[PDB]
A paper describes a structure:
A single proline substitution in combination with modifications to the fusion-activating trypsin cleavage site and the addition of a foldon trimerization domain at the C-terminus of the hMPV F ectodomain generated a soluble construct with antigenic characteristics of the pre-fusion conformation. The asymmetric unit contained a single protomer of pre-fusion hMPV F, with the trimer axis aligned along the threefold crystallographic axis. Interestingly, the N-terminus of the hMPV fusion peptide (Phe103) nestles inside a hydrophobic cavity of a neighboring protomer, whereas Leu105 resides inside a hydrophobic cavity formed primarily within the same protomer. Our structure reveals that His435 is located in a parallel β-strand (β22) adjacent to Lys20 on β1, forming one of only two parallel β-strand interactions in the pre-fusion hMPV F structure. Electron density corresponding to N-linked glycans was observed at each of the three predicted glycosylation sites: a single N-acetylglucosamine (GlcNAc) was observed at Asn57, both core GlcNAcs were observed at Asn172, and a Man2GlcNAc2 glycan was observed at Asn353.
The hMPV genome is a single-stranded negative-sense RNA molecule that encodes nine different gene products, including three glycoproteins: G, F, and SH10. The F glycoprotein is synthesized as an inactive precursor, F0, that requires proteolytic processing to become fusion competent. Cleavage generates two subunits, F2 and F1, that remain covalently linked by disulfide bonds. The mature hMPV F is a trimer of disulfide-linked heterodimers that is incorporated into virions in a metastable pre-fusion conformation.
Author numbering:
A (entry chain F), B (entry chain F), C (entry chain F): 19 to 90, 103 to 472
Write the structure that this text describes.
């Protein structure tokens, strides 16, 4: 990793990250076979088996009041919530195909002689179909034989404990779908075991290196996917799991951090703040800007981003890290007439905007307070310090390793006359700030 | 459903939705009876029963370090987080009444001879009271008799397994309240079973059709409610569940989507974006605008909205979908001098803002890439395509069925001279953009 | 608590709150000993013990595809998400030290003869180390002896049920880390029991009163901390729990609420809205402003705030509650030319902005609709009413007790000529609104 402190704008850019981009969704349809449990009855009073049977029938009946479909410029603000909404739209759209009675029987037909099969739906979409039959097999082969004419308080406690082991997964699947109205927020271990997740990732329509990274880091696949209830069909619970396809890996990414750049003359301030902070990743000849926090996530040098969360930006947008004052690109900034003191942590350090009214210092976990910082924008290396403080507020630096570089330059905010600085601006092109000053003076 | 593409503003409006509005809260107070478990002791070493007894006493003691109260213009930004905060304020306010010692004894008195009773609190609020006594009954009638003088390693394993079945609900109730500091985020199956949820909804102060919809879709009632711990009173755990009352159903709702409308002349751009996107629902003679995402949620043609999340808007606000340029209503927009290419998915299609610098196409799940899109704002029907792409970013269209209509009109952005277009604006009335151009030229 | 209604700005300030500020993180490292389970085999077919053994080995193997690090001006917008990101950076930074093989052996060495030990890491940071050995002890001392040559279908069901009791905690630890990709969102009862949480809080580097408050309210410590997986080392699962250190308590805090202040003349409106809403707390000679919702949380008179979420503001910023029009502090506001009717709930009442187009009233839970409100900004006491409504939207008031006071003053919005009121402003200093009017007229 290589981090550049951009002195002219009180910002950093950290390069050397490797992309892991979610480019598609792989659909794994499940049929969890429960078995013939309605036709089982316990009439000999309270029992361990009766308790497990009553839980199982109550969970199966509860599943029918759950339904996932039919009833039973500020760049960051433009992209906010898009990927999350896009994920639900995609999942609900294919669930509409799967929910058809004919599509379900076709799924069950593909699973008659095996526990896994690749299937194509009526809309031409290819999915993986998986059967889960232990509970049905236990009910048919073992439990029903032991309840000869409705006597469940049998001396075999192994049978009662076996029942509670075999129905645990089905009960959790019902809990997770009933609590979330049919759309789970993630892929639990009851929707998809480790073996099933490894089997589904291996079947994804992408290349070997992508599948190897997803297999070796499948807890992240778990975290980025979700499950949708399709419905109950006979004694089978049918749901689908949307698995993220990380189809592009190891392309260049970089992150931009920024803090308020304030310059003062005669007690008055001119301040600006870069509004292009966040992650950038390249793919197939274009650069995508991911302006919102929840949309990208690092694991070491790799950054996991949802492509549906980004905005395609021009290549020239990188000149905001180069010649922000003179560039022809409309570099986005906000402005203020009064300073904000704060800390913007970087991958390899911290940006410290320390202005009049606060005290700032850097600290060591072994040695304590190292030094007080001077007023202005300061760049602290995580080799220089372990913590940075604004007054008493502690900011713990990362310990990520990499080379830091200072790209010298007079802060653009220093060129402003505070007496002529415009009204506070929010997410405006920087040349519109200059245009405001130049027009108001003419 | 009927979707109109508004060519003059690069936006859509989809009508035909049916409201499900949360209008009130129904309070269900629970007394979970644990029984006399403190006066039980296991002195014969490690045991299955001892393990279950130690879990139960540890969970009961842990519940006393949990407390829910006392210690032991940009329309979207104005409404953000209001409903969530309002829900907690309402729940904490009535929990203040219920937490009184006199109010608790009155609740316990109403439940002496039955497991459910309608009760009125000292503040005149009517609640449902529910008793849960299995664990107390098992402890009193069964477990205590088997521990004759502190010997728990008894040959009866049925007793140990029965204990672990009977205490499971109480342990989960303690887990859910301890992890969330007394205020659960939703209504779990341990706070309220399917039968208890069906009983509470049936007792709600609303009409039959509302109760029928809530009963048949009670997983959504689960998802929109939450639970508050009241405290431990003797051997009884007392909590309350706030259940959403969907008191208004099947009134007209509609959703507005929008994408940047950009017009270019001689390499310069004038762009605007509608800032009135989101859900609108009518009720009792007024129109409520729900500007934030998490506040409404669809299930087919029905949309579930929290009324505390909306802003009452004038009826005339709908003319932004009709005569946005000439209307007297202050239609909210943002502006830019440079284009943003993006996709805004609609219920029945997609708005594609495709401008210089990116490539856009529409695809089919059977046939592949259908066609490249021309530069400008395009409306794609979900009958025309299955996916829309900006460069490599895929947006999956919905498969919702309904009639699409194009309402022709010259884009308002085409009327602007880019050389005279104002500084970037955020959530301003559209006539203030024209006023800025007209004033700056005078 | 003492609440002041500020008539000149349609806002309230509520004083008398006591701070509970998260000032640091205490790290509790765990080694959960699983035991020699790989070298156990069941070859006699299906068994209860085999099922528990297969779950345990599958959970142990699944834990190796989980990794938390390396792969296997608008004040509110500036501070949004800072504390959450800072918490993860701090936790990942110390996990980098703990993940070293030498650091792990040192932790295991400190725990050889005891279940708890204070240890200092190579980076000079002091942590608490905790061992959890029941599952290993059960596997070594009890389970392995019962499987004499791979026969697990033994007549001892006590052994099978004991196994399922002893492995429950380890299975849940694996579930919570696998679902969240190694970084749990909170501290569950399986990461840290009540006794371990009480032991860790008692060891925190803070004063007695802070530890007593944290001990007596440790469910909030649970809610504000989280856990990070370090890895699997032999048969030991190693994770760390970041516990919030509430190192400052009972210093003054106050909250500011606001609603649109609109004045109309001849059918035209001039409106402003205070944009300094939120929590303020004092500490060590400075005032910190917490502009975002999720960053502070009340429990009675105490408010729990994360210090990493705030912005250090000048003491003079409080004059926005005193002389907002004449003060030299740049009091932040937004503006509009058209009114927004809404309700801003206060700790001891409600601000009601009731303008043309809507109807507003206050209600009682015993008596019903009390009275219709007049147009303008109204302050309702929670002693006056139980609910406030805008049209049909109900806002339930709190029942918090305290003294209310009206600080009389002509609304600043009344001083504006609507015909000369500027374009809509977002988060601008109030004197810049006056400057816009005065400059545009010159
Ligand atoms: C802000 O900074 C960016 C990045 O530094 C800068 O963009 C760069 O501009 C230079 C201007 O020369 C580009 O270099 C040119 O590239 C073209 C081909 O595309 C060449 O034909 C040019 O060659 C001429 O000049 C050479 C000497 O400089 C001669 O050797 C040659 O014979 C030609 O006369 C020249 O190399 C460069 O490609 C871009 N870089 C990128 C990545 O865009 C931008 O101009 C700056 N903006 C400002 C300050 O206005
Ligand atoms: C933007 O579009 C909206 C919606 O299209 C539009 O609002 C509409 O304005 C028309 C103007 O006529 C309204 O229709 C009038 O309604 C009143 C009663 O409220 C009638 O008295 C009027 O009748 C007169 O004109 C009729 C012929 O048009 C004659 O037959 C009659 O004898 C009268 O002379 C007339 O019907 C209409 O009600 C509204 N619609 C709504 C829902 O508000 C608005 O004016 C447009 N704004 C612009 C472009 O400035
Ligand atoms: C907006 O309101 C705030 C708060 O009310 C206000 O700040 C206050 O200003 C007064 C102005 O007098 C300050 O009081 C002064 O404090 C200094 C010491 O710091 C004293 O030297 C001054 O004493 C002189 O005046 C006294 C009589 O008023 C005489 O008795 C004495 O002999 C001196 O002549 C005086 O007490 C006060 O400290 C501040 N308060 C705070 C907390 O800042 C602000 O000025 C207002 N802004 C406006 C309306 O412009
Ligand atoms: C359910 O019943 C089947 C059939 O009796 C059991 O499977 C048999 O197990 C014995 C060993 O006890 C083997 O010798 C047989 O070959 C098995 N037969 C078949 C068809 O698999 C099974 O163990 C029972 N399940 C439980 C949990 O007890
Ligand atoms: C707890 O003890 C009660 C009382 O002995 C049990 O209830 C009895 O069950 C028998 C059948 O075994 C019936 O014939 C009696 O009529 C029941 N009596 C009453 C008063 O209900 C109960 O089954 C025991 N519970 C458990 C879980 O074993
Ligand atoms: C695991 O085995 C140990 C050793 O046999 C058991 O501990 C003994 O328990 C008996 C009572 O049954 C005591 O009299 C002994 O003093 C204990 N010995 C030791 C060394 O602790 C232990 O109970 C077994 N665990 C389980 C769950 O059965
Ligand atoms: C219960 O028995 C009836 C009659 O034999 C049968 O038609 C029905 O399918 C059975 N139920 C299940 C779930 O198999
Ligand atoms: C335990 O026994 C004492 C004395 O008999 C009694 O007062 C107390 O209420 C009992 N505890 C419970 C929880 O019933
Ligand atoms: C299993 O047995 C081998 C050989 O005795 C030993 O080296 C290994 O450490 C054992 N596994 C565990 C987890 O102890």
């Amino acid at each position: 990793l290589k981090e550049s402190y951009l002195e002219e704008s009180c910002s950093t850019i950290t390069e050397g990250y490797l992309s892991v981009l979610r480019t598609g969704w792989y659909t794994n349809v499940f049929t969890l076979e429960v078995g013939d449990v309605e036709n089982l009855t316990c009439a000999d009073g309270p029992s361990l088996i009766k308790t497990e049977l009553d839980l199982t029938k109550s969970a199966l009946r509860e599943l029918r009041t759950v339904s996932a479909d039919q009833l039973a410029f500020v760049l960051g603000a433009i992209a906010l919530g898009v990927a999350t909404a896009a994920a639900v739209t995609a999942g609900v759209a294919i669930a509409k195909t799967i929910r058809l009675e004919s599509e379900v029987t076709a799924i069950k037909n593909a699973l008659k002689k095996t526990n896994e099969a690749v299937s194509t739906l009526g809309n031409g979409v290819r999915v993986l179909a998986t059967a889960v039959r232990e509970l049905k097999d236990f009910v048919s082969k073992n439990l029903t034989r032991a309840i000869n004419k409705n006597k469940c308080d049998i001396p075999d406690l192994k049978m009662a404990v076996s029942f509670s082991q075999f129905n645990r997964r089905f009960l959790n699947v019902v809990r997770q779908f009933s609590d979330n109205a049919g759309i789970t927020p993630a892929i639990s271990l009851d929707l998809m075991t480790d073996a099933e997740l490894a089997r589904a990732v291996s079947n994804m329509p992408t290349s070997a290196g992508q599948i190897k990274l997803m297999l070796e880091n499948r807890a992240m696949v778990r975290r980025k996917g979700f499950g949708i209830l399709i419905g109950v069909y006979g004694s089978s619970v049918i749901y689908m799991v949307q698995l993220p396809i990380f189809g592009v890996i190891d392309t260049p990414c970089w992150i931009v951090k920024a803090a308020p750049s304030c310059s003062e003359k005669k007690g008055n301030y001119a301040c600006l703040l870069r509004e292009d902070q966040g992650w950038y990743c390249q793919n197939a000849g274009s650069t995508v800007y991911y302006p919102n926090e929840k949309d990208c996530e690092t694991r070491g040098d790799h950054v996991f981003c949802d492509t549906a969360a980004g905005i395609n930006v021009a290549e020239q947008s990188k000149e905001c890290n180069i010649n922000i004052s003179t560039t022809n690109y409309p570099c986005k900034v906000s402005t203020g007439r009064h300073p904000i003191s704060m800390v913007a942590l970087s991958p390899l350090g911290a940006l410290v905007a320390c202005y009049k009214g606060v005290s700032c210092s850097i600290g060591s976990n072994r040695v304590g307070i190292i030094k007080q910082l001077n007023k202005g924008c300061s760049y602290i290396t995580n080799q220089d310090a372990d913590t940075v403080t604004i007054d008493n507020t502690v900011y713990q630096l990362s310990k990520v390793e990499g080379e830091q570089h200072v790209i010298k330059g007079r802060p653009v905010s220093s060129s402003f006359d505070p007496v002529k600085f415009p009204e506070d601006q929010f997410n405006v092109a920087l040349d519109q700030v200059f245009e405001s000053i130049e027009n108001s003076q003419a």
